Amino acid sequence: SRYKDNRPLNILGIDISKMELGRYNLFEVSIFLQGSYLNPFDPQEIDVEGIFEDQYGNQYRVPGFFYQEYKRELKNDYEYLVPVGDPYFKIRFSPINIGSYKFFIKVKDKTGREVSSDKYTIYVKESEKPGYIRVSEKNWRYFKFDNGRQFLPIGANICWATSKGTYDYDVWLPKCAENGGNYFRVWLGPSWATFALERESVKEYDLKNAWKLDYVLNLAEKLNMYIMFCFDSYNELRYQKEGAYPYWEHTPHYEKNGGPLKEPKDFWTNNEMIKYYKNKLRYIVARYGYSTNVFAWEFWNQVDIISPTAFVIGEVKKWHEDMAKYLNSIDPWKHLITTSFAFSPGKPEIDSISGLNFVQTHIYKSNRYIDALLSLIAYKEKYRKPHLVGEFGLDAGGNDLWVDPNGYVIHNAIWTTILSGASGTAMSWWWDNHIHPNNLYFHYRALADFVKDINFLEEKFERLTNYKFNVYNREIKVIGLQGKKYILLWLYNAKEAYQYKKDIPNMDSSKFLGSIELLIKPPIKVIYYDTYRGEKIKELDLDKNVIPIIEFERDLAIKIELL
Ligand SMILES: OC[C@H]1O[C@@H](O[C@H]2[C@H](O)[C@H](O)[C@H](O[C@H]3[C@H](O)[C@H](O)[C@H](O[C@H]4[C@H](O)[C@H](O)[C@H](O[C@H]5[C@H](O)[C@H](O)[C@H](O)O[C@@H]5CO)O[C@@H]4CO)O[C@@H]3CO)O[C@@H]2CO)[C@@H](O)[C@@H](O)[C@@H]1O
Ligand SMILES: OC[C@H]1O[C@@H](O[C@H]2[C@H](O)[C@H](O)[C@H](O)O[C@@H]2CO)[C@@H](O)[C@@H](O)[C@@H]1O
């Protein structure tokens, strides 16, 4: 209990970040206090709350959180955080309406003593921010912002840094954002993760790693990127003898390391563990819930491959139902909630629960993965909520970087997923050893420039059918969407798309290859798009439903407008 206090409860000072701010912007309160508590991360020991009210009756109860300031520096090849001042408490709020808000602070500690502040008034003006990310009410396959604009996630996993810490995100995130990226995913566990909150303990959270997460969230704010926060990863509950990067013997949950659990199976039902997990969810909501740049709360990375001694489907299901209900109830902004599985088809008993707002697929597969992605996307339409292919790679034991240095595998996956009805791109692994050093960001820029001017929420897209190839001496296949105004095609050569040795294609041809006939009514405008250079190649006005295919090396995109 390094942070314990044993003084009578009193507010000593309050700092306010600004009295005028924009819609959805951060309003931060710093609270200096003394009190009686053993653990500032436990609301039964000390409970800080900010009570906000707008002009329209809406009240918000925002939990406060323990905070330490740091100053970062680079010590050769590793980040070092120097503490600045004593720790204190913060409240982080974001206004959804404009106009006036009144608020005050309430604090209660374990003695039952309660103190409060006077009421303060702030004023909120309109801003450029689109709001929080929600499921689209127009098309349940897709996400939107509160203001109605679509959110199509384009990006990759960027789940932890090297020893350089936040200084790696200083490099990766601007490169991603300038190439059309608006999404990434970070890990808040296991204990070795850059942003691990449960580093030494499951009862107290790591203030340095939480500060790094602040920093990276602030960088995403500046770059208009949106983050999935993955709270826990399967390794935490997987025994050393089971392989696959296990970590149970080292995890703070284990009694050997000071935690409440004698075995990982007890995670789902141990009363002490459940209480501390809820405290962690409260801490996460308190410290990060304000942010519209939090796209989603994700409970688990691949919960199905925890130890088989620990995976009890009914208990994992009930835990997800209960925690999703608790998290939603304490989150004033009601962020999206999800979870993930390593098994590519997922677990319908869990994917079907209403408290998970969208489903995911992880798939690592080397052979015919285009067909596998299409099949999984078609299959999971049964859930009637968005589908994110949250992890994708070859099944090559991490050897994607030597097998495919040009990123053709990533290329194939992002085009296939977006044009098959998934909510956004397939999200690659290997951000640090592959995407960045091989400079693969251009693939995302080409795709983003192709899709960004289409409102997917309103096209009523469905997977392409009713088509007829007429192509000789070549095997061309199609992934496509047919909408009320647009038809989007990705054509690929089946004999070239899975070969990765050749250099990046340089500029297709002037020649006719073949044709594809579509069940559509002319006239139409046809745009041919180079998926590697990310540019229009050719435009063609047509009076019939037979679309010529120009010569191309590996793959080609076509945008068709119904006139
Ligand atoms: O440096 C930080 C940290 O790294 C840790 O190791 C990392 C490792 O470097 C990779 O980045 C790896 O990436 C995998 C992620 O876990 C991801 O969620 C996903 O998960 C894998 C899973 O790890 C595992 O490989 C699993 O294996 C399958 C296997 O493919 C086959 O199906 C077999 O029959 O079953 C097992 C499952 O029982 O496959 C999952 C995907 O299906 O895939 C990513 C790529 O592999 O993450 C590691 C951490 O999880 C440690 O070295 C740590 O010490 C170090 O500090
Ligand atoms: O920050 C990510 C890693 O960057 C590395 O530097 C790269 C740099 O980003 C760029 O790609 C340049 O062309 O090559 C450098 C490596 O040769 C390293 O600084 C590494 O430590 C970082 O983790």
Q: Which residues pair with 103 in a beta bridge?
A: 52, 120
Nearest C-alpha to atom 8 of ligand 1 is from which residue? 245
432 and 324 belong to one structural domain:
yes
256 and 111 belong to one structural domain:
no
- Coil, helix or strand for 450? helix
Task: Ligand 1, residue 342: give the atom nearest the CA.
Answer: 42
Task: Ligand 1, residue 301: give the atom nearest the CA.
Answer: 18
In this structure, are residues 89 and 287 in contact, taking their beta carbons and an 8 Å threshold?
no
Q: How far is CA 443 from CA 420, 509, 530, in A?
A: 18, 20, 11
Nearest to 191 by CA among 180, 170, 172, 205: 205
Of the candidates 95, 125, 155, which is a domain's last residue? 125
Does the Cβ of 300 fall within 6 Å of ligand 1? no
Sheet with 150-151, edge to edge strand ranges: 133-135, 143-145, 150-151
Nearest C-alpha to atom 15 of ligand 2 is from which residue? 437
Which CATH number fits the domain that encloses residue 508? Answer: 2.60.40.1180
330 and 278 belong to one structural domain:
yes
Separation between Cα atoms, residue 133 and residue 482, nearest integer Å: 25
CA 314–ligand 1 middle distance (angstroms): 25
Separation between Cα atoms, residue 214 and residue 229, nearest integer Å: 12
Which CATH number fits the domain that encloses residue 329? Answer: 3.20.20.80
Residue 282 counted as domain residue = yes
Residue 536 counted as domain residue = yes
318 and 222 belong to one structural domain:
yes
476 and 398 belong to one structural domain:
no
Strands 226-233 and 183-187: parallel
Does the Cβ of 168 fall within 6 Å of ligand 2? yes
Domain holding 27, by residue range, is 5-125
What crossing angle do the helices spanning 207-223 and 271-288 adopt, rounded to 10°?
40
Residue 342 counted as domain residue = yes
106 and 152 belong to one structural domain:
no
Q: Who contacts 174 (Cβ-Cβ below 8 Å, separation ≥6)?
A: 223
CA 419–ligand 1 middle distance (angstroms): 28
CA 432–ligand 2 middle distance (angstroms): 9
Nearest C-alpha to atom 7 of ligand 1 is from which residue? 245
DSSP letters spanning 129-173:
----EEE-SS-TTSEEETTS-EE---EEE-----TTTHHHHHHHH
Task: Ligand 1, residue 162: give the atom nearest the CA.
Answer: 1
Does the Cβ of 94 fall within 6 Å of ligand 1? no
Nearest C-alpha to atom 1 of ligand 2 is from which residue? 168
Dihedral sign of CA atoms 209, 212, 214, 216 in order: negative
Separation between Cα atoms, residue 555 and residue 473, nearest integer Å: 16
Residue 442 counted as domain residue = yes
Does the Cβ of 342 fall within 6 Å of ligand 1? yes
- Coil, helix or strand for 535? strand
191 and 321 belong to one structural domain:
yes
Q: Burial-class residue 330 by CB neighbours within 10 Å (0-12, 13-18, 19+).
A: middle
Gyration radius of the chain's alpha carbons: 25
Q: How far is CA 105 from CA 116, 282, 441, in A?
A: 5, 17, 45
Task: Ligand 2, residue 164: give the atom nearest the CA.
Answer: 23
399 and 469 belong to one structural domain:
no
CA 222–ligand 1 middle distance (angstroms): 31
- Coil, helix or strand for 439? coil
For the stretch 266-293, what's the b/e string if a residue is b when 16 or more beta carbons lie within 10 angstroms of its beta carbon? bbbebeebbebbbbbbbbbbbbbbbbbb
H/E segment holding residue 203: none
Chain centre to alpha carbon of residue 532 = 25
Q: Which residues pair with 481 in a beta bridge?
A: 463, 488
Separation between Cα atoms, residue 548 and residue 489, nearest integer Å: 12
180 and 76 belong to one structural domain:
no
Count of CB atoms situated within 10 Å of the CB of 352: 15
Strands 467-471 and 476-482: unpaired
Q: How far is CA 62 from CA 91, 111, 129, 164, 332, in A?
A: 7, 22, 21, 33, 7
Of the candidates 419, 451, 483, which is a domain's last residue? 451
The 3-state secondary structure of 79-136 reads EEEEEEEEEEEEEEECCCCCEEEEEEEEEEECCCCEEECCCEEEEEECCCCCCCEEEC
Task: Ligand 1, residue 160: give the atom nearest the CA.
Answer: 2
Residue 456 counted as domain residue = no
Task: Ligand 2, residue 168: give the atom nearest the CA.
Answer: 1
In this structure, are residues 298 and 102 in contact, taking their beta carbons and an 8 Å threshold?
no
Q: Who contacts 33 (Cβ-Cβ below 8 Å, separation ≥6)?
A: 9, 10, 11, 12, 48, 88, 89, 107
In this structure, are residues 360 and 299 in contact, taking their beta carbons and an 8 Å threshold?
no
H/E segment holding residue 520: none
Does the Cβ of 162 fall within 6 Å of ligand 2? yes
CA 219–ligand 2 middle distance (angstroms): 18
Tally of domains within the chain: 3
165 and 238 belong to one structural domain:
yes
Q: Who contacts 34 (Cβ-Cβ below 8 Å, separation ≥6)?
A: 5, 7, 8, 9, 10, 12
Of the candidates 451, 478, 498, which is a domain's last residue? 451
Dihedral sign of CA atoms 364, 365, 366, 371 in order: negative
Joined tokens for residue 94: 């974001």
Residue 306 counted as domain residue = yes
Instruction: Give the ligand with the smallest distance to the CA of 173.
Output: 2
Does the Cβ of 291 fall within 6 Å of ligand 1? no
Does the Cβ of 399 fall within 6 Å of ligand 2? no
Nearest C-alpha to atom 10 of ligand 2 is from which residue? 437
Which CATH number fits the domain that encloses residue 41? Answer: 2.60.40.3880
Nearest to 165 by CA among 75, 284, 295: 75
Separation between Cα atoms, residue 539 and residue 177, nearest integer Å: 29
Within 13 Å, how many C-alpha atoms sit on residue 429's CB side? 15
Residue 192 counted as domain residue = yes
150 and 207 belong to one structural domain:
yes
For the stretch 520-551, what's the b/e string if a residue is b when 16 or more beta carbons lie within 10 angstroms of its beta carbon? eeeebebbbbbbbbbeebeeeeeeebebbbbe
Residue 457 counted as domain residue = no
Resolution in A: 1.6
428 and 379 belong to one structural domain:
yes
Does the Cβ of 175 fall within 6 Å of ligand 2? no
